[PDB]
Ligand binder design. Structure first.
Ligand SMILES: Cn1cncc1-c1cnn([C@H](CC2CC2)c2ccc(-c3c(-n4cnnn4)ccc(Cl)c3F)c[n+]2[O-])c1
Length: 236
């Protein structure tokens, strides 16, 4: 996260850190708890992942340094990537992880609601992006989970900034015209979380952008409301 600040314990309890363990253990991507056995993340995260065997899902983590050899994690039973996914910038950047067992929800690990039916024309004004990613283009994975408030951009404006890509209704863009706050390397797969009527909704999945927090280049997120039918089909 560029231009963000440290979170505190319990602040974003649907945020998980997805680790790979091949050839060594490290944070790979963010993700969001959406059901007791379900994580929503980005399809692009699984480039070069040979199988679910090498993945570990950690919930309730504030600092990456908390994770030791006896820290409990969830195994991944299945990775479900959208059948039309080809590359992040072309869309369909969405994946479900089915966990090997059910999360018992606690103060530190909680689900986030999907965008609610009948809310498609809501204007979200309280949106946040979170993650352990770089604070600048050439940086390093951060120890403490970071947060930044970022405004949504219309798809018309976003397309004008990305005339070499097809910005579709299944994408949502977020960023300041002057730059300065954005997702960056290591944040992808995590949530764009928006609060509406004091309820948090998973509005976006952190996906791609031109650089990090550059002027007039918003971050691009998978527009989760356009995938609710797909999510419900797979989780049922
Ligand atoms: C894990 N890891 C450890 N060391 C470095 C990484 C690392 C490098 N790439 N990634 C991922 C893609 C990789 C998982 C398959 C990525 C790509 C792009 C953006 C991004 C960008 N960025 C543009 N240029 N950089 N970021 C801008 C806006 C937005 Cl919304 C974004 F989602 C964010 N992530 O995470 C992680």
């Amino acid at each position: 996260i560029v231009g963000g600040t440290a979170s505190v314990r319990g602040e974003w309890p649907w945020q998980v850190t997805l680790h790979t363990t091949s050839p060594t253990q490290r944070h790979l991507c963010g993700g969001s708890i959406i059901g007791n056995q379900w994580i929503l993340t980005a399809a692009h995260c699984f480039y070069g992942v040979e199988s679910p065997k090498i993945l570990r899902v950690y919930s309730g983590i504030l600092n990456q340094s908390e994770i030791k050899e006896d820290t409990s994690f969830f195994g991944v039973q299945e990775i479900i990537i959208h059948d039309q996914y080809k590359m992040a910038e072309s869309g369909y950047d969405i994946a479900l992880l089915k966990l090997e067992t059910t999360v018992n929800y606690t103060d530190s690990q909680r689900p986030i609601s999907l965008p609610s039916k009948g809310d498609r024309n809501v204007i979200y004004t309280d949106c946040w992006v979170t993650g352990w990613g770089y604070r600048k283009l050439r940086d390093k994975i951060q120890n403490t989970l970071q947060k930044a408030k970022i405004p949504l951009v219309t798809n018309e404006e976003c397309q004008k900034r990305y005339r070499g890509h097809k910005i579709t209704h299944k994408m949502i863009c977020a960023g300041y015209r002057e730059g300065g706050k954005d997702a960056c390397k290591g944040d992808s797969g995590g949530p764009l979380s928006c609060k509406h009527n004091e309820v948090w909704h998973l509005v976006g999945i952190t996906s791609w952008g031109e650089g990090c927090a550059q002027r007039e280049r918003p971050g691009v997120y998978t527009n989760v409301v356009e995938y609710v039918d797909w999510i419900l089909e797979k989780t049922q």
